[PDB]
Design a binder for these strands. Structure first.
Ligand code: MG
Ligand code: MG
Ligand code: MG
Ligand code: MG
Ligand code: MG
Ligand code: MG
Ligand code: MG
Ligand code: MG
Ligand code: MG
Ligand code: MG
Ligand code: MG
Ligand code: MG
Ligand code: MG
Ligand code: MG
Ligand code: MG
Ligand code: MG
Ligand code: MG
Ligand code: MG
Ligand code: MG
Ligand code: MG
Ligand code: MG
Ligand code: MG
Ligand code: MG
Ligand code: MG
Ligand code: MG
Ligand code: MG
Ligand code: MG
Ligand code: MG
Ligand code: MG
Ligand code: MG
Ligand code: MG
Ligand code: MG
Ligand code: MG
Ligand code: MG
Ligand code: MG
Ligand code: MG
Ligand code: MG
Ligand code: MG
Ligand code: MG
Ligand code: MG
Ligand code: MG
Ligand code: MG
Ligand code: MG
Ligand code: MG
Ligand code: MG
Ligand code: MG
Ligand code: MG
Lengths: 262, 158, 134
RNA sequence: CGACUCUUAGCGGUGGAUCACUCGGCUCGUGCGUCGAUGAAGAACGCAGCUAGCUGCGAGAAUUAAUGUGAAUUGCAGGACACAUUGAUCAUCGACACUUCGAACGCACUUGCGGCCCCGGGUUCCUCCCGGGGCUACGCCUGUCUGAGCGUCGCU
RNA sequence: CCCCCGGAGCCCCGCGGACGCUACGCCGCGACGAGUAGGAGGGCCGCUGCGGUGAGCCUUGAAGCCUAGGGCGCGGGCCCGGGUGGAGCCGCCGCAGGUGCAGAUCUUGGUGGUAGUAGCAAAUAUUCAAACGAGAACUUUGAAGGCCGAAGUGGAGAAGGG
RNA sequence: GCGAAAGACUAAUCGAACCAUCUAGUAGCUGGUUCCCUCCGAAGUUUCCCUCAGGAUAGCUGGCGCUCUCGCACACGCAGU
RNA sequence: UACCCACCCGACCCGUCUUGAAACACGGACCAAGGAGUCUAACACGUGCGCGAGUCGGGGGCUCGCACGAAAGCCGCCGUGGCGCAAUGAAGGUGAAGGCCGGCGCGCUCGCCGGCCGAGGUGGGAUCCCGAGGCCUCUCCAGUCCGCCGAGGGCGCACCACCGGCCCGUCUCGCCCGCCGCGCCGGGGAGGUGGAGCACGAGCGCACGUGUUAGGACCCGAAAGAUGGUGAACUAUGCCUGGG
RNA sequence: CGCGACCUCAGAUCAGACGUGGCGACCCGCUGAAUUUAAGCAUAUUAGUCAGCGGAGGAGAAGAAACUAACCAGGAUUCCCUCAGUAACGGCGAGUGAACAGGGAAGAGCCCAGCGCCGAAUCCCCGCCCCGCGGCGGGGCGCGGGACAUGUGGCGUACGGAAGACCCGCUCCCCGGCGCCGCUCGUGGGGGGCCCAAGUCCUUCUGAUCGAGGCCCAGCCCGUGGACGGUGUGAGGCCGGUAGCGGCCCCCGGCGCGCCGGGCCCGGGUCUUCCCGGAGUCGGGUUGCUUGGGAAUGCAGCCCAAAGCGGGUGGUAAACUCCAUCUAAGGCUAAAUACCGGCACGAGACCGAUAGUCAACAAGUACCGUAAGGGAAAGUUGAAAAGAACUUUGAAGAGAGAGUUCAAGAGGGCGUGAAACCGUUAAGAGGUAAACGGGUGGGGUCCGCGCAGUCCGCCCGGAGGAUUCAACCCGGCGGCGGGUCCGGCCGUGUCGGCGGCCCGGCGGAUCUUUCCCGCGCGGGGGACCGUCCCCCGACCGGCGACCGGCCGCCGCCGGGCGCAUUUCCA
């Protein structure tokens, strides 16, 4: 509030009464008389620089920046190393860019959605999520942020034909429409590579959503995939190709312990 | 106390700004108050151009905006007794009427009369009553449409 | 997840909707399930407990199998008193010990003109939704 | 081994830190946008079987009828009730009620003085006297009534 | 002929490479190390909260607190042992702060030394016996001595108090 | 305001009351300014200023770099000489 | 190592202003909790990231009752607009090209017509290219493969130093003009000089740091000033009415 | 010296109405500082801000050009982005500081006076009846009043209008009721009431669990419900709830047909005849405040004080002079717009009892001040009071036993219970105040040990004892790698197909209007180029992008191998 510890009418009778020079509360027959107000130091008072409302709360990103944050988010949803390294319990999943039939868009009972996540061997992620339930550590308990859990597999769908009703109760599962992807849900915590479960209809639109390499997006105005600072991202093969090996000074590995001078 | 090659920086905070600071946390909720009105008005006048009545073709005044063309305030009077639309009637058939436009040229006159001849042709007048007289377009081209024109009617493209 | 805005779900707000809740509301809150036998016959899951219903204690130190009859309802203390649910004080003068209805099972409803229209309209509502999903 | 003193530890006080809670705030949104001479906001004084304070109420005073609700209320009494009953209690609230001040309004602020009408006792309007009810503030509008003017005239 | 390392048997091996290789990791040489005001860097230094994550911990005892208990770090601090305590809590990767106190005649609260000390010294005065009582220098009654001495320490009022 | 006058008195306040606000008034001036380790490390001088308890600009300081050199048998450059 | 004790040596109480503090300088009995460089805007440079002569971002719009959403996504909106892409003059205004060759005006360091090249040159220039010659290889010689060294020679980025050149302002001086008009019309030249200029670009947006300001502005601190109010129950007088 | 009109003006406790006060976040008139800044200060600045005062509303104000502009021109107001920290102001310093255009939200326009026309065509209040009555009205009837000729009503208002002539085309809306039909978006409008899934299943902890394993798919069931709260811990299933075009009952809102009562003879275009605008205002002089507005933006006071092809504006005074552009002096108006008050809600990277509002509590309370005003402290027993009966000592406060409790080492200011400080027990010390740094020594509390700590781990040799293999082949499985790129799939660079090209599209100020559709333009086709796709063939990167066979090796399983082997143990 703009009025914190600033409705007191204290004068600071000072410099000769041996006390402090702090604005002290006027007159009275209470305890709060000659106490000290308008001080960051003193009981009551206000803080240092009262938190004001016009703090620049919200932030900004370039359009292409937050588009190409989704490419790297998606490209890492493949590559099971990156995916498992986020602890997404993919050890029995048949393939990592997991595509499902478009029957799933029309499920309308959580029983079927639960049955799907067994046959794809995706249970173990919700299983994990199911186990990660507990109370938050801090004072966040008494502000409506009591319980916490992991994130589960994300499911992407091209049209809400009832699917979001099915996979609604299963904890950890989030639903993301293709045309409305979201970095805050594809890569939670600024870490990369969360499990995704694409349906066939959505898996097609992905190249038409934001583009292949030698073709425009054709759903975004003007946009194409980012190019590579380097192609052969592996250098273990580069460093033992015959081109490089041939043109190298021979090594020096006779580590020369210092000689004691006799 | 300046130091070593800055700017001069007259910033306007001497007066009292902290009191009259207007924060914009309404901004996303106002986007929604307007959106309902925009929709609730379209559903209230159901068969009707949602954008509103038809506005005329018009040129921008100053020499820097010479070559553009706008949607004007309303079709002028001199325009109207060429297309043969009474000035009080046009207000009732979705034609903005501006009784304040001095026409100086025949170029911008005919160019702007054409939109009124064009409006008539693709205009479907639901008749006054269900069983009603002339100038109300037939029931064939009454069943065919309930279409509100989303966006401006016949958008003026430069 | 709750969806309807115009409902609260706020840790301290519906703790406040509880211990300031008027006696008229506190009937529904002080409701206790029905035994498997009645739960079959009426198709009613739970009931507001009444003054002279029969009851079995299910949790607590002296959960058991003996069927007592309720004696009163401390709707202000928000907890009921039962028949042989009682301890001995220091002077031998026995007192009842409160039991929460949620921790007790009803074994024989006390029927009434009022209670019967409740059991009907509870059951009629339960099979209306099962007919709606059907 | 004297006592005192000091350091440390075991326990015991003194004190209320830390920690864990939270029917409270603060901030930001949303809907609405609701006073009063038919007497407001505010103030006073009263009102519970045992009740000081908070709260709730207004001599019909911890509420009235009504409608939902449907067996309590509770600190202790005490109770009606028939819990097959407007039916205990709570919620709603739309019927009725609204002590004294207060723009406050018969004049004044002592709580004092009046006037004018009516209706009881008194009277047999006999005037008090006693009791009860209705009026009696300022400004202004429209109309109404009674007027004033060597103002303008008209008729005489 | 003078041959093949799936085998020369290896102090050189170019055919395959460490335990070592978190490649912002590991290793070998040298040189050098004062410090206020001030700057910079590093802080698996610490505090609260959020997005992740730890198939984390927890009524077989969490936070806090207490410890002549065993230790680690140059240090910020940290880990363990026991104890009491009775419900929650921390590790890592990122984000956010009202984030670290010896001091400001700092603020609020608490507590000492001073100290069982200064003090309980303005208007001459008390004593005996009894009663009551668990208990009497101090109450009450009786007796004795006394003072105020009617411009009163007496008898009634105003304002004020309630 | 009131003063037979002392700047007296005006509710313990008077060379100019008390109360709340403008108000977190201004301060070239006192006081304080909270964890470790590592590396570098000053000034009190210059000109101008209603300047002399302060600033401005010079220096002195640190950080960030870059351009190259060649101890990789094969160096130009600088210097409190 | 930490508890108590003993000894030998060392050793003044911290914070602070200060040329100088153990100071006969000031703050500090003790212990807990609180307690001081913050946010916003505006510049500046450094740094990270996206895109790149462009690049946005806002306000709007299109998509929700948000659970997570007052988020995310999308829009010839995306350029209306800002910043950049161009300067220079007070202003009317003008506005970044030169070189070369041939031909034609008398090549007159002047004017015009056809062709070629296009951002000039010098000196350093990281530096790549070419490389004479070497240096072996078990023989004498032959000879193609592979590198090491490599005198000498070439292109030469970035940048620095310099000379040129062009744009605009101003001056000087001087020539020829074009002619929808008439020249108190307009247009060109040579030489100097003013410019935050061009001389084949580097910006935009988003982060973070440091610094300087405007903000209460690192926290605490005046003597004052102003606007409205409340007091004569004390006391200062005057009055009214009582008492001595 | 009368009576009667009217004009002025009084009095009524006359009939009927209405105004005051409160709130005050946002709003509208006026008033109006000084701290401060300028390193002094007086102009400036703070600032048309605080205080003062008046007045409202659910929004207010503004608003239909006496505008902007100089353009090939725009078209009420308000708000947002922008203009732009720019034009201008300023001891030209500190500092101040707009607009126009453009984009967008929203979008709505209208009345008078006058001039005229109309027999005042008008309005108000009475009195009787018809309907209606909890926003007092409609219908009719009355020599019942009165206002009005010093001016009410209809047409009409500058965009032109009226009146005429003839040109053309044919006529439902409004209101008072009376009903009735569709409950009418959060996906049934507003409000209320009542209602709608699934374990208290096994075992086990515990004072009590909502915990830990388990239970026909992370176990059983439900899941359009797994938010939250309650419950003797940590609960989707126990309870309330939650989800759900879920159900049911009232009420209210709002819109849709019928009946009735009344109102209403309401058009459109052409030619002519007239008809016109708001005065102590504009404008000028001047003085004062104001803006940024400058030889004067706006506002005022005083003085002067108009015009009718006039007047204002056209951002340096002035004359002359042309152009442009509006129409002042009268009035009404929804929408976007604002809300630190109020009612009712929702949320949070917020605070968590010295924090967060002064106020988590009997808080604007206790209390102070004559008064204006000032103004606190103070949350937690347990889960349930089960709040200590009884015995005993004491005048009593307090104790000792007992009891309750999971716990009273939770006892009514009672969770946790720190430090200072104090009490006592233990241990050690003690003439240079204590404390301290380095170095050891002595004693302690514990801690590690050992009742040898001789620490282990290979390999080997020897002596004991025991089970089955390794080595080898044979059957099967599964890999690895390899190349013949062998066969096929895959993709890079190239070439060919001009084959997708129209059975590939998108883009392009490329081109054609020979086209088509619509009104030179727009839309659509057809031509063109750039780009992206099919057929096949060739070369090459043969690429971690595979599949099949062949091979080589490995491994596991199963067989065969019975013991100079191969393992175990001591
Ligand atoms: Mg505070
Ligand atoms: Mg619009
Ligand atoms: Mg002790
Ligand atoms: Mg203790
Ligand atoms: Mg406290
Ligand atoms: Mg007269
Ligand atoms: Mg050092
Ligand atoms: Mg904590
Ligand atoms: Mg507890
Ligand atoms: Mg914080
Ligand atoms: Mg602290
Ligand atoms: Mg005497
Ligand atoms: Mg007396
Ligand atoms: Mg000094
Ligand atoms: Mg000195
Ligand atoms: Mg000295
Ligand atoms: Mg000093
Ligand atoms: Mg002054
Ligand atoms: Mg008022
Ligand atoms: Mg100053
Ligand atoms: Mg100063
Ligand atoms: Mg001064
Ligand atoms: Mg001034
Ligand atoms: Mg001003
Ligand atoms: Mg004000
Ligand atoms: Mg208005
Ligand atoms: Mg108006
Ligand atoms: Mg405008
Ligand atoms: Mg700009
Ligand atoms: Mg100003
Ligand atoms: Mg008229
Ligand atoms: Mg349930
Ligand atoms: Mg639960
Ligand atoms: Mg719970
Ligand atoms: Mg004027
Ligand atoms: Mg001014
Ligand atoms: Mg001029
Ligand atoms: Mg007007
Ligand atoms: Mg407290
Ligand atoms: Mg606390
Ligand atoms: Mg507080
Ligand atoms: Mg406590
Ligand atoms: Mg506490
Ligand atoms: Mg305990
Ligand atoms: Mg306890
Ligand atoms: Mg305790
Ligand atoms: Mg001792």
């Amino acid at each position: 509030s703009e009025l914190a510890g600033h409705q007191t009418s204290a004068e600071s009778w000072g410099t000769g009464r041996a006390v402090a020079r702090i604005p002290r509360v006027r007159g009275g027959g209470t305890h709060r008389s000659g106490q000290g107000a308008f001080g960051n130091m003193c009981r009551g008072g206000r803080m240092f620089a009262p938190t004001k409302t016009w703090r620049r709360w919200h932030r900004r990103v370039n359009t292409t920046q937050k588009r190409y944050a989704i490419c790297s988010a998606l490209a890492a949803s493949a590559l099971p190393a990156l995916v498992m390294s986020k602890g997404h319990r993919i050890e029995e999943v048949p393939e990592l860019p997991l595509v499902v039939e478009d029957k799933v868009e029309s499920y309308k009972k959580t029983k079927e959605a639960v049955l799907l996540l067994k046959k794809l061997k995706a249970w173990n992620d919700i299983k994990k999520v199911y186990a990660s339930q507990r109370m938050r550590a801090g004072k966040g308990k008494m502000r409506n942020r009591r319980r916490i859990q992991r994130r589960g597999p994300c499911i992407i769908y091209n049209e809400d034909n009832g699917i979001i009703k099915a996979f609604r109760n299963i904890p950890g599962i989030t639903l993301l429409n293709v045309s409305k992807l979201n970095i805050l849900k594809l890569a939670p915590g600024g870490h990369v590579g969360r499990f995704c479960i694409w349906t066939e209809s959505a898996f097609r639109k992905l190249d038409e959503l934001y583009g292949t390499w030698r073709k425009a997006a054709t759903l975004k105005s003007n946009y194409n995939l980012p190019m590579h600072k380097m192609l052969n991202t592996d250098l273990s093969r580069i460093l033992k190709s015959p081109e490089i090996q041939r043109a190298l000074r021979a090594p020096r590995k006779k580590i020369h312990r210092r000689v004691l001078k006799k | 106390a300046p130091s070593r090659n800055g700017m001069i920086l007259k910033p306007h905070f001497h007066k009292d700004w902290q009191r009259r600071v207007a924060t914009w946390f309404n901004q996303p909720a106002r986007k929604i108050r307007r959106r309902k009105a925009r929709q609730a008005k379209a559903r209230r006048i159901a068969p009707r151009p949602a954008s509103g009545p038809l506005r005329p073709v018009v040129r921008c005044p100053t020499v820097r905006y010479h070559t553009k063309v706008r949607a004007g305030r309303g079709f002028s009077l001199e325009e109207l007794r060429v297309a043969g639309i009474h000035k009080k009637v046009a207000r009732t058939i979705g034609i903005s009427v501006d009784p304040r436009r001095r026409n100086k040229c025949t170029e911008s006159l005919q160019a702007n009369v054409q939109r009124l001849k064009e409006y008539r042709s693709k205009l479907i007048l639901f008749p006054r009553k269900p069983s009603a007289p002339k100038k109300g377009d037939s029931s064939a081209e009454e069943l065919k449409l309930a279409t509100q024109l989303t966006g401006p009617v016949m958008p003026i493209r430069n | 997840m709750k969806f309807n805005p115009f409902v609260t779900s706020d840790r301290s707000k519906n703790r406040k909707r509880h211990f300031n809740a008027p006696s008229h509301i506190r009937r529904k809150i002080m409701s206790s399930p029905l035994s498997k036998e009645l739960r079959q016959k009426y198709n009613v899951r739970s009931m507001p407990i009444r003054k002279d219903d029969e009851v079995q204690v299910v949790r607590g130190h002296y959960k058991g199998q003996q069927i007592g009859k309720v004696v009163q309802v401390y709707r202000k203390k928000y907890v009921i008193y039962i028949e042989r649910v009682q301890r001995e004080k220091a002077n031998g003068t026995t007192v009842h010990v409160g039991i929460h209805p949620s921790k007790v099972v009803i074994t024989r409803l006390k029927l009434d003109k009022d209670r019967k229209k409740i059991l009907e309209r509870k059951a009629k509502s339960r099979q209306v939704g099962k007919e709606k999903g059907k």
